[PDB]
């Protein structure tokens, strides 16, 4: 699971029963560089067929 | 003497103006484009969009995209573009060194694409000192 | 029609057809040095506007190719380049018809074998003299060995690389020679003018190609 | 050999005086700047 | 016809090369 | 003798083949030239420059076989 | 005499072997030419000016061929 | 005689077969030359610089057949 | 005689059917060369190394045919 | 005798027919190498080490015929 | 006389026709190889392994014709 | 006899026209081999094996001519 | 007599000319084969289920002409 | 006799020229089969079906290689 | 003697050059066909019905030379 | 002698040179045909109508080969 | 007689050399035609028009020499 909001990742990091890693944050504006960071991580996560 | 240039991006429209030449860098070619060009559809990726306006040869570096570059009304659907001299030299060189720090990390085939994109961020950044 | 000799004996039967052509072209080339630029200037002048463009062009085609040690070979590029393309001008352009030398036939320096083989040998032993200082003084011509396929080689190629550029200019000067003479041997002068410009094409093109050719040999020679 | 070759050479060298002025139009640029 | 006409002319061309190199290239 | 009888056939075969290579040469040259012109009718001066440039090379390749054919029949050294 | 026979078969094979090159040349040239006119018809002035300038060199090659083949067939020194 | 016949046929075959190959090569060379004069401003110096080089190299390649042809014709070492 | 008549045809056929191959070879070697130079107008620094190394070595390939052809004419041990 | 003529022509054909082969392959490999350099200038040493190896194998195939050329020319234990 | 004069021409045709195919082969193989190296320079080890493998086996294909060319002339059990 | 010459020329033709094909084949074979296993650098499980099988089959093809080379070289049945 | 003199050339031409087509055939087969297998790490022997079969069938193409060559050489009722 | 000489060479040229087409043919089908199974090895059954269904006639071509050879060799109707 | 061995060589060259033509056409049609079943095995019956229709036509293209062989070999109308 | 042997060698070379082009034609047309059902497996209503036909036309080209085959077999006009 | 042998040879060569070209012509024409049927069946009337007209003109091309062959043979006012 990928978390995108800091409220989200703060909820997520308390419970590791759900397999969760690689959380990021873009707040008050989705900046093109932050959306590109999300794009980079999810594309590099898909280039391995581990994740479909 | 020019074309209608529209370099777009997800949340912005970076540089809509008229310029003599367009030297966008694809993977297979750094296709120089200039007025009355026949409609080509390039897959423009990492590299500088060197353009030569008659004032000066102001360069802009784009992280990737696409360009339905046709008859003087082109739309270079760029992923991420930083126009002109908005990029800063010393921070760009330190960013290249940090990209080297991200280049040597780990992990088989999963993370090497992020390593590639960090290297290519550095290739975007080399434009700054060249600007 | 006869490219062999002038009967100028020098004890060992030397060809004067090389001699007089080489003399006249060499003389014009060295004597254009002060047409208007005997007192040169920062602000370009009469002969300066000729010479400095050639010098900068030579630096362009050389420093890229020759390498870090560009300076000891700046004469090497310019002499061969200017001399050869101006002598090709004199060979394809300068007429000698109504007055004929009783011994031989003279139109060009590079016509005879000796001229161009001498120039080629010059460039190639200049390559070897470059490799003298700029390679291991044990092995300079026969240095490299891959997984053995090149055991007699890297010297067999440079045996004939001088022969390569020599014959390169051989056939190309004989080319314009024959093309000029045959159509005049056919019909009066005014008919081949459509292709005399073609004969002038390669005559003007030989400049840059021989410059970058022997300069590529010299860029190999940096090592 | 002289006649036709010298006429086409005159064509060449008149265009070539023009081209030498065109080379002034390249190096005069740098020396004038 | 090789025998020695080619180096006999090559030596004078070499002298030309060096002297022309001086009188033109150095200034 | 048959020196002329073989000179004629040699020059014929020469001038026959001497136009093959530069033929398809000038062809694909013009093909890519006109493709570049279609892509840009603005650098056309600097395209036709490079078109003349190589077309003259091949039209000087053919005159090689031409002058050999002429030095066989008209300006023959042997007979 | 057999020399004239050799000259005739020479000229035949000369004008035959001549135009294989020029044919495919004009072919690929005109093919890419019209497919480029499809991309941009507003360049046709210098389209023709370059097309004709290459076809002129190809036709120069093959008229060189034909005219030599005729020089064998017509008044020739060796016959 | 027969020596002259076998030499003139050699010179004609030499010029023809040395013309046909470098012509086809020069063709694709001018094709790739213009491949880039749609990329005008990065091209008119560098493309011409390497193109004159390569194309005069191919001119040399066929000139090697030419000089052999003229060696057979004019300055025959045997005869 | 007939052995010299075989040497002379050997020389011309050697130079022709030798240069026919390196011609289209180095031509297609250009075929991507100045295309790639137009693509990347900055790496000529080692392009003119790697090519012109290739071209010097195929230049060697055809002057192999030359050092055969000329020597078969002037200095042949047999005739 | 007759065997001498057969030998010199078997050398003259051998040079060209062995040289034509690796020529076009060397050309294709050189074009691909320079295109590689131009698409990825961040690969220089690998491409040079491969293209020199290519030149090595091709010139090997050339000398593969040139050795029989030398054997026919200079020293046949029968001729 | 005819047997040796045919053995020598057989060796000539053999060394001519043997290396011509593997020439184009090794060249096109290394051509695709160097573009593969340009695209993916990382796994270069087994890549060059395959390269040298196939090139050595084509060297075997041509050394067959070579040992023919030599063993025919030198150690001949016919004459 | 008159058959020994026809036998040795048969061997000379056989091994050469045997070797011409394997080379051109192994060319595209290895070229697409290195290309595929360079693009995808990991899954060469049975691929190096199948490369070796193809090279074995084509080396078997050319030694199908090498057997004829021996059978036309040795003092074997009738000639 | 000419009987075995034609039998040997028959055998040579038979094996050489049965060796040419199968060569390039098996080669393009192997090239496209590694194209196919190198992309998808599927059951590589299963994907070879067509390649190895066709390679055997092309070897059968070869062995046809080869056993005809052996029947011409040894088991010849004519000579 | 002369028929006894001509029979075997007719047979060999027949088998060869009937073989060379099937080689490059079967190669294309094999390679496209592997490239097709590379897309997905889904059916594979009717893929081997069309493969072997074609291969029936592609080896019928091999039969026609020597059916106009064995009738000459084994029992020549004229001799 | 003359006419008999002539008919023999005739049938030889006949059914030699017969099978080559469709010998590659069958392979190309099958290579597109296996791509057919690979891309879509949906209309396998119609693919293969069109397929057998093409391959039988090529089969008959070979039966042309085969029936003229059966006419020439045994049921010779003249001889 | 020279009366009817020419007729049969003419028939042989006729049916030989007949089925070389029609074969490649059948192959390419049938390949694109089955590509038709590779992509759109629904036009088989007239895909069969243009695959049975137009291959009937390519055969109609070679039924002329049948004509010149059987024209001399049944009744040669002269002999 | 001493004539009409070359006549029947001409007819034989003429039918095959007539069928070679139009064969591959109809091949590529019908190939792109059935590719057109694959791309759309809506203009099937114009498809049939162009296909039939092209291929009929191909048979016309072949008949332009077939008439020469038959009139040559049957009752030609020469022989």
Residue K23's nearest CA partner among K52, K61, K71, K53 is K61
Q: Can you tell me the distance from the alpha carbon of C151 to that of B52, in angstroms, rounded to the nearest whole number?
A: 53
Chains L and M touch (3+ CB pairs under 8 A): yes
Cβ contacts of P17 on chain O, cutoff 8 Å: 17
Give the position of tokens 């010297």. C155
Sign of the C-alpha dihedral computed for residues A8, A14, A18 and A24 taken in this order = positive
Taking CB atoms and an 8 Å limit, are C150 and J53 in contact across chains?
no
Q: Can you tell me the distance from the alpha carbon of C33 to that of C48, in angstroms, rounded to the nearest whole number?
A: 9
CATH of the domain at B63: 2.60.15.10
Q: Are residues B13 and B68 in the same domain?
A: yes
Output Rg (C-alpha) for chain A, integer angstroms: 12
How distant is the Cα of B42 from the closest Cα of chain H, in angstroms? Answer: 13
Q: What is the DSSP string of M1-17?
A: -HHHHHHHHHHHHHHHH
Chain C residue nearest residue I42, CA to CA: C64
Query: Please, are residues P6 and Q8 in contact by the beta-carbon 8 Å criterion?
Result: yes
Q: What angle do CA C219, I52, C88 make, to 5 degrees?
A: 80
Cβ contacts of H10 on chain F, cutoff 8 Å: 10
Chain Q residue nearest residue P7, CA to CA: Q8
Beta-bridge partner residues of B76: B7, B67
Q: What is the DSSP string of H6-36?
A: HHHHHHHHHHHHHHHHHHHHHHHHHHHHHTT
Distances (CA, A) of O7 to O4, O14, O71, Q17: 5, 10, 11, 21
Query: Please, are residues I2 and I68 in contact by the beta-carbon 8 Å criterion?
Result: no
Q: Can you tell me the distance from the alpha carbon of C140 to that of C126, in angstroms, rounded to the nearest whole number?
A: 13
Cβ contacts of J43 on chain K, cutoff 8 Å: 37-38, 41
Cβ contacts of F38 on chain B, cutoff 8 Å: 38
Count the neighbouring beta carbons within 10 Å of the beta carbon of residue P59.
22
Please compute, for residue L1, the number of CA atoms within 13 A of its CA located in the half-sphere on the CB side.
9
Cα-flanking dihedrals φ and ψ of residue B59, to 5°? -105, 145
Helix, strand and coil content of chain G, in percent to the nearest 5, comes to: 90, 0, 10
Cα-flanking dihedrals φ and ψ of residue B64, to 5°? 165, 180
Please compute, for residue M17, the number of CA atoms within 13 A of its CA located in the half-sphere on the CB side.
26
How distant is the Cα of K26 from the closest Cα of chain J, in angstroms? Answer: 7
Sign of the C-alpha dihedral computed for residues H50, H56, H60 and H62 taken in this order = positive
Q: Which of N21, N23, N43 would you mutate first to test chain P, the one with the most P CBs within 10 A?
A: N21
Taking CB atoms and an 8 Å limit, are I65 and J16 in contact across chains?
yes
Neighbours of chain H (3+ CB pairs under 8 A): B, C, F, I
Q: Can you tell me the distance from the alpha carbon of K34 to that of C45, in angstroms, rounded to the nearest whole number?
A: 51
Helix axes G2-18, F3-17, angle to 10 degrees: 10
Q: Which of H3, H6, H15, H63 would you mutate first to test chain F, the one with the most F CBs within 10 A?
A: H15
Chain M residue nearest residue O34, CA to CA: M50
For A49, residues 6+ apart whose C-beta sits below 8 A from its C-beta are: none
Query: Please, are residues H55 and H25 in contact by the beta-carbon 8 Å criterion?
Result: no
Query: Please, are residues C37 and C45 in contact by the beta-carbon 8 Å criterion?
Result: yes
The three-state secondary structure class of B60 is strand
Taking CB atoms and an 8 Å limit, are P23 and O22 in contact across chains?
yes
Cα-flanking dihedrals φ and ψ of residue B105, to 5°? -85, -75
Neighbours of chain O (3+ CB pairs under 8 A): M, N, P
Query: Please, are residues F68 and F20 in contact by the beta-carbon 8 Å criterion?
Result: no
DSSP label at N75?
Answer: S
Sign of the C-alpha dihedral computed for residues C55, C58, C60 and C65 taken in this order = negative
Taking CB atoms and an 8 Å limit, are B113 and A44 in contact across chains?
yes
Cβ contacts of H27 on chain F, cutoff 8 Å: 21-22, 24-29, 58
Chains C and E touch (3+ CB pairs under 8 A): yes
Query: Please, are residues G78 and F70 in contact by the beta-carbon 8 Å criterion?
Result: no
Query: Please, are residues I23 and H23 in contact by the beta-carbon 8 Å criterion?
Result: yes
Taking CB atoms and an 8 Å limit, are B80 and A44 in contact across chains?
no
Query: Please, are residues F34 and G47 in contact by the beta-carbon 8 Å criterion?
Result: yes
The three-state secondary structure class of C15 is strand
CB-nearest to H40 from B29, B30, B32 is B32
Taking CB atoms and an 8 Å limit, are I33 and H54 in contact across chains?
yes
Neighbours of chain F (3+ CB pairs under 8 A): B, C, G, H
Buried-exposed string D5-24: b where 16+ CB fall within 10 A, e elsewhere: beebbeebeeeeeeeeeeee
CB-nearest to O38 from N10, N31, N37 is N37
Q: Are residues B22 and B46 in the same domain?
A: yes
Please, is N34 exposed, middle or buried when counting C-beta atoms within 10 Å of its C-beta (0-12, 13-18, 19+)? buried
Query: Please, are residues N23 and M25 in contact by the beta-carbon 8 Å criterion?
Result: yes
- What was the structure determination method? cryo-EM
Helices (H) and strands (E) in chain E, counts: 1, 0
Distances (CA, A) of P60 to P18, P47, Q13: 12, 19, 18
Q: Can you tell me the distance from the alpha carbon of C71 to that of C62, in angstroms, rounded to the nearest whole number?
A: 10
Please compute, for residue B47, the number of CA atoms within 13 A of its CA located in the half-sphere on the CB side.
23
Residue I20's nearest CA partner among J13, H55, H61 is H61
Neighbours of chain E (3+ CB pairs under 8 A): C
Query: Please, are residues C126 and C118 in contact by the beta-carbon 8 Å criterion?
Result: no
The tally of domains found in chain C comes to 1
Q: Can you tell me the distance from the alpha carbon of C186 to that of C194, in angstroms, rounded to the nearest whole number?
A: 15
Q: Can you tell me the distance from the alpha carbon of E10 to that of E24, in angstroms, rounded to the nearest whole number?
A: 20
Q: Six-digit token pair at P42?
A: 């629904």
Q: What angle do CA B95, B120, B53 make, to 5 degrees?
A: 90
Taking CB atoms and an 8 Å limit, are A47 and B10 in contact across chains?
no
Please, is C31 exposed, middle or buried when counting C-beta atoms within 10 Å of its C-beta (0-12, 13-18, 19+)? exposed
CATH topology classification for P1-76 = F1FO ATP Synthase (1.20.20)
Q: What angle do CA Q15, Q20, Q22 make, to 5 degrees?
A: 100
Reading across the β-sheet that carries B67-69, which strands appear in turn? Answer: B12-19, B3-9, B73-77, B67-69, B40-42
């Amino acid at each position: 699971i990928i978390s995108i909001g800091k409220k989200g990742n703060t909820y997520f990091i308390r419970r590791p029963e759900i397999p969760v890693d690689r959380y990021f944050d873009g707040t008050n504006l989705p900046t093109a560089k932050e959306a590109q960071a999300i794009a980079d991580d999810v594309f590099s996560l898909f280039v391995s067929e581990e994740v479909d | 003497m020019t074309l209608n240039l529209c370099v777009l991006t997800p949340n912005r429209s970076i540089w809509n103006s008229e310029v003599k030449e367009i030297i966008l860098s694809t993977n297979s070619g750094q296709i120089g484009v200039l007025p009355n060009h026949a409609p080509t559809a390039t897959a423009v990726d990492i590299g500088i969009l060197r353009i030569r306006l008659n004032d000066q040869w102001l360069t802009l570096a784009l992280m990737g995209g696409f360009a339905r570059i046709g008859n003087n009304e082109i739309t270079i659907l760029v992923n991420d573009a930083e126009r002109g001299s908005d990029i800063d030299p010393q921070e760009a060189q330190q960013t290249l060194e940090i990209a080297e720090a991200n280049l040597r990390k780990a992990e088989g085939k999963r993370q090497k694409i992020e390593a590639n994109l960090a290297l290519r961020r550095a290739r975007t950044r080399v434009e700054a000192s060249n600007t | 029609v006869g490219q062999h000799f002038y009967w100028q004996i020098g004890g060992f039967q030397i060809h004067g057809q090389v001699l007089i052509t080489s003399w006249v072209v060499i003389a014009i080339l060295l004597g254009s040095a002060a047409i208007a630029v005997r007192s040169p200037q920062t602000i370009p002048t009469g002969g300066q506007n000729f010479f400095e463009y050639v010098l900068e062009f030579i630096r362009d085609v050389s420093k890229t190719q020759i390498g870090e040690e560009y300076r000891p070979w700046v004469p090497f590029i310019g002499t061969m380049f200017l001399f050869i393309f101006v002598s090709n001008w004199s060979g394809a352009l300068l007429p000698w018809k109504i007055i004929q030398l009783p011994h031989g036939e003279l139109a060009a320096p590079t016509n005879d074998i000796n001229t161009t083989v001498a120039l080629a040998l010059l460039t190639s032993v200049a390559y070897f003299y470059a490799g003298l200082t700029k390679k291991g003084l044990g092995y300079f011509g026969k240095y490299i060995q891959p997984t053995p396929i090149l055991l007699p080689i890297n010297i067999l190629e440079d045996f004939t690389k001088p022969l390569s550029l020599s014959f390169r200019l051989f056939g190309n000067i004989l080319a314009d020679e024959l093309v000029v003479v045959v159509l005049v041997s056919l019909v009066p002068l005014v008919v081949p003018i459509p292709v005399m410009f073609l004969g002038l094409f390669t005559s003007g093109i030989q400049a840059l190609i021989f410059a970058t050719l022997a300069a590529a040999y010299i860029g190999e020679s940096l090592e | 050999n002289l006649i036709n070759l010298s006429v086409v050479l005159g064509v060449l060298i008149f265009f070539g005086k023009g081209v030498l002025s065109d080379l002034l139009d390249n190096r005069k640029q740098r020396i004038l700047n | 016809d090789f025998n020695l006409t080619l180096p006999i002319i090559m030596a004078e061309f070499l002298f030309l090369m060096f002297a022309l190199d001086k009188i033109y290239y150095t200034p | 003798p048959l020196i002329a009888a073989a000179s004629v056939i040699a020059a014929g075969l020469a001038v026959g083949l001497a136009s093959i290579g530069p033929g398809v040469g000038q062809g694909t040259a013009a093909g890519q030239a006109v493709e570049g012109i279609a892509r840009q009718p603005e650098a056309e001066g600097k395209i036709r420059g490079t078109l003349l440039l190589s077309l003259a090379f091949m039209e000087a390749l053919t005159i090689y076989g031409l002058v050999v054919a002429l030095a066989l029949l008209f300006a023959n050294p042997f007979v």
